[PDB]
Design a protein around this ligand. Structure first.
Ligand SMILES: CC(=O)N1CCCNCC1
Length: 93
């Protein structure tokens, strides 16, 4: 059975206006800004942007990749697909 989301989990993450996007649940570094309650820090592959999202917008990557893991015209998306498949736990700072 599923657990709660934890840092390192791979997802597609959904935001208004954008296709389901390859992403991971990030850690919060010591001294860094914490997310709001019930929100996770989401790191978007390809764009390397961070947003705070709740589980309603988080789709586990293995279950969803057949649906969501296809190339897209949007800036950063295809680089994002490479990252999530090839080095999803790397430093992208
Ligand atoms: C984090 C964010 O605002 N976005 C929009 C730009 C593309 N990355 C997907 C989600």
């Amino acid at each position: 059975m599923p657990h709660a989301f934890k840092p390192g989990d791979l997802v597609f993450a959904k935001m208004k206006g954008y296709p389901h996007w390859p992403a991971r649940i990030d850690d919060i570094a010591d001294g860094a800004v914490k997310p709001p309650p019930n929100k996770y820090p989401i790191f978007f592959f390809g764009t390397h942007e961070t947003a705070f999202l709740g589980p309603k917008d988080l789709f586990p990557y293995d279950k969803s990749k057949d649906k969501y893991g296809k190339p897209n015209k949007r800036k950063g998306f295809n680089e994002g697909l490479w990252e999530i498949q090839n080095n999803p736990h790397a430093s992208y700072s």
